[PDB]
Amino acid sequence: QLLKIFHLKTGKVVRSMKISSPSYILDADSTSTLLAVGGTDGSIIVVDIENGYITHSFKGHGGTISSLKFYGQLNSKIWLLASGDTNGMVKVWDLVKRKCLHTLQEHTSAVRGLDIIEVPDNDEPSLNLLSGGRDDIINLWDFNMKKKCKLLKTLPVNQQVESCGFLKDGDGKRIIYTAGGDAIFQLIDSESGSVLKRTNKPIEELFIIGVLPILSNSQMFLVLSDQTLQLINVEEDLKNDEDTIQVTSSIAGNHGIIADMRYVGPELNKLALATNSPSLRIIPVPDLSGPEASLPLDVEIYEGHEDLLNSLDATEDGLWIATASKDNTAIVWRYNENSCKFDIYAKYIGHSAAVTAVGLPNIVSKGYPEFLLTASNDLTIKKWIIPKPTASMDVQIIKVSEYTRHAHEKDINALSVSPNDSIFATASYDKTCKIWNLENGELEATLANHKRGLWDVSFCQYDKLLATSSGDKTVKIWSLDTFSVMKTLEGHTNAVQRCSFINKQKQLISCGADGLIKIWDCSSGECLKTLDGHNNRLWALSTMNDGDMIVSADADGVFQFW
């Protein structure tokens, strides 16, 4: 029960509306820009102005409301124009008092958007009334100020509706956006009951939509979804310049939870994060504003998956972006959004368990960054190496039968490449970290003294040390000869998930379930600094080359630079 009135962008309460007993669910603003009435589950309508004057009780029907829209002579909800109901019914009223002029009963399914968008003339010489929000059909209603009404057509061309649009001039000859709950928005034609083109981007139910202040065939258009916005071209069909439905841009935001992060841009421009969403969002680093408007490429999210993403990585210049997910595959994406198939270099099939970690070799210019070193929960690790064409271009099968490296019983949680291509060590949940050679796939070393599984291991870029994290509140650092344990850091008040070095080989920066990030040094083995601006669990980390900006990961979508 909160329907509160504000003023200019200070935001102070002018008056508080909590008077009616049912919880207010819907509300819209006015073309007079001064009056506001809210929809609720008791069919309770209260016309209020802001000075404040909260006028005459309108009470003539029950039910519930889930859509509302106004008019310049009938300035109320869909309780006056028509009736927002849970069974579907059109009720005829007026701006004059609570008499009932005419009544109209046609629906058998629930519908609340009976006059979800106006007909601006209310005489309809060539105009129409459009309606639907729950009944999953589109009906074409007449308007009669004194007689019963007629249905013009019905449209069973949809399977689910939530909101209806209508051309501003009202003829309907031009584009008409209809947003349905079936992850589908369409361009329809009112006088003929036919679609122009249907557009299928999302995998989620469309929310309700209001109006744009634009005229006819518009200039831009905005589509609403889950923590993302997208701008669409305005033809979608051979109207002015182009057809065969396309998307102009898809501006990305931020998700609450984050698993991993990796710098994409070669001058440390772009960051790509892996979330619970099955998409690739690239906002964060160059955008010191809110949502993305300043990344120097075509801003567009990627999708080639069916489940969530587990770990993601790229090389130095950022031309190959290899990612890992739960759909048992490995997909590498290109920097500047070009390929031969869609934007995918190749999708690699052959994993018998979930693909929980992914990694690249060191950069040269080609070859090694053309390759792929991915990991799966099938107690193995898989290297895809085809050198004779340019690799990461085609579907590669080189390690599926017995070329895979299998000596594990609990799953490997991470993997790291040395600055040379010779050795690489992966950490695993069975309290050990193993060094294997990349040229052969033979067990080079077995490093273990722990009390919990090892979620992250990484090398120093001077390849003199080794950094690994275990859930016994300690971060351990090893020699390059594996004949002597070098250093054992303790002081973290809980478990450490991920540890990493700085690019000047100065500091060990750690991230765990503490609630604060810690920067120890790799030189004296003491605490150089700790940083405390979090209260959630820390899961990922990334280091720039310069050492001033350090980005961290939280559980609520907060990225803190230091």
Binding site: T86, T108, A110, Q160, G181, E204, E205, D226
Partner: protein, 214 residues
Amino acid sequence: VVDPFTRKEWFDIKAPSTFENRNVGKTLVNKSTGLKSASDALKGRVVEVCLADLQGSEDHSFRKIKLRVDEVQGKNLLTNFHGMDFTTDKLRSMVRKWQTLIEANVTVKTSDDYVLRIFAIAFTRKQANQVKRHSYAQSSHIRAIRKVISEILTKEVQGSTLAQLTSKLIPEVINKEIENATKDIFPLQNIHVRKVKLLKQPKFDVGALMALHG
């Protein structure tokens, strides 16, 4: 983030004939897509409501009625009588010290071949001007009590399908027939029916189902 409660069908329950008002209540089903259509999916939901809440007669606040779904038609679905049960508060109200608990069970077929097993509860009362504090049975009269109930229950079943038997269970006509016959042995108190449940419904059979409908 899916929010399935903008996707579920809102749906209602229609009741059979020999009752009071056929409006019952609501459910929530699914969105009728192809491959999971909503009609053929469930077909067997179970409604368990006190009959006093539907009959209106407030001297029936125990003895809840179990229902079973058969047919569905488009914001209507029709249900069938599956079981009848007492509340736990009702029989545990009854069981007093210094008296004898007599039960009976019988497996008996209806006219249309619904096989149903009912139970029975019987309690001993004191007469007027009793002196003794218990008034038990004789352990052979209990044989004479279980046998009279057993032959009466087989007579009333297999006749005029279960709705009329439901039309006898509601005003509990059965209890007076138990009462008068078995009184010559030993008088009695509270006797009720306490359960009926079914396990051998023959067939789908829409033909006799629509004869109760208006």
